[PDB]
Amino acid sequence: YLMKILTERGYSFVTTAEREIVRDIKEKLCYVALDFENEMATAASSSSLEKSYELPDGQVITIGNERFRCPETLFQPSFIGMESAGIHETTYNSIMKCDIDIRKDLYANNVLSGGTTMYPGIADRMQKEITALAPSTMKIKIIAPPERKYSVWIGGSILASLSTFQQMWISKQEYDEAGPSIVHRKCF
Amino acid sequence: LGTRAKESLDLRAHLKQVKKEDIEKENREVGDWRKNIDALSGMEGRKKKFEG
């Protein structure tokens, strides 16, 4: 989507190699707006947002309100034509499907992980959205550790280092006896 | 009438004494905990949770 909206200024990236350049632009410049309409209005009047970036050959480019419009797709998947609701509302729906007595704990211990949750300013936008959706009494807290990108791998290391887990591996003789369909069995 | 009043009061007083004896007897079971706080400004553990 960023590669598609950059074409509104004149920069055309098409080759599968230039997708990497657009990815670098997204990583280094884009950020999630706290309030979308106010940012759209501000970027359309002033010019305090236009940040420039140097391509791998020169010819610097200037990104205007494409900065916070690219990652806004997360909270409004209608931008890329997807029907579903944003990541701010699928979390609330996932909570509401849970039982009525563990919703407070889930509200208080919302965890973020994965690479794409590294946008500057997402841990505040998501908290604001959920606080808008959730009942006013519950406390909404969003855990955003600085080591977000490698969180899954750190957890994997911790799990593999446990003594209690040492007998859950799928030993080779077990695979030889039941075939590849062993993974769906007790050894999950 | 005096005898009837005396016997009724004697029975009532005996029952009340039987109750009140144990009422005063084991009344310390009310001792429990209050769970105060100290702000725990001295916890500096490490990230090694493997026991869960």
UniProtKB/Swiss-Prot annotation, chain A:
Actins are highly conserved proteins that are involved in various types of cell motility and are ubiquitously expressed in all eukaryotic cells. Belongs to the actin family. It is found in: Cytoplasm, Cytoskeleton. This is Actin, alpha cardiac muscle 1. MICAL1 and MICAL2 produce the (R)-S-oxide form. The (R)-S-oxide form is reverted by MSRB1 and MSRB2, which promotes actin repolymerization. Demethylation by ALKBH4 is required for maintaining actomyosin dynamics supporting normal cleavage furrow ingression during cytokinesis and cell migration. It comes from Mus musculus (Mouse). In vertebrates 3 main groups of actin isoforms, alpha, beta and gamma have been identified. The alpha actins are found in muscle tissues and are a major constituent of the contractile apparatus. The beta and gamma actins coexist in most cell types as components of the cytoskeleton and as mediators of internal cell motility. Transmembrane segments: none annotated. Polymerization of globular actin (G-actin) leads to a structural filament (F-actin) in the form of a two-stranded helix. Each actin can bind to 4 others.
UniProtKB/Swiss-Prot annotation, chain B:
Coiled coil: none annotated. Phosphorylation by STK4/MST1 alters its binding affinity to TNNC1 (cardiac Tn-C) and TNNT2 (cardiac Tn-T). Signal peptide: none annotated. The modification Phosphoserine is found at residues 8, 41. Troponin I is the inhibitory subunit of troponin, the thin filament regulatory complex which confers calcium-sensitivity to striated muscle actomyosin ATPase activity. Interacts with TRIM63. Binds to actin and tropomyosin. Interacts with STK4/MST1. Belongs to the troponin I family. This is Troponin I, cardiac muscle. The lineage of its organism: Eukaryota, Metazoa, Chordata, Craniata, Vertebrata. The chain holds residues 160 to 211 of 211 of the full protein.
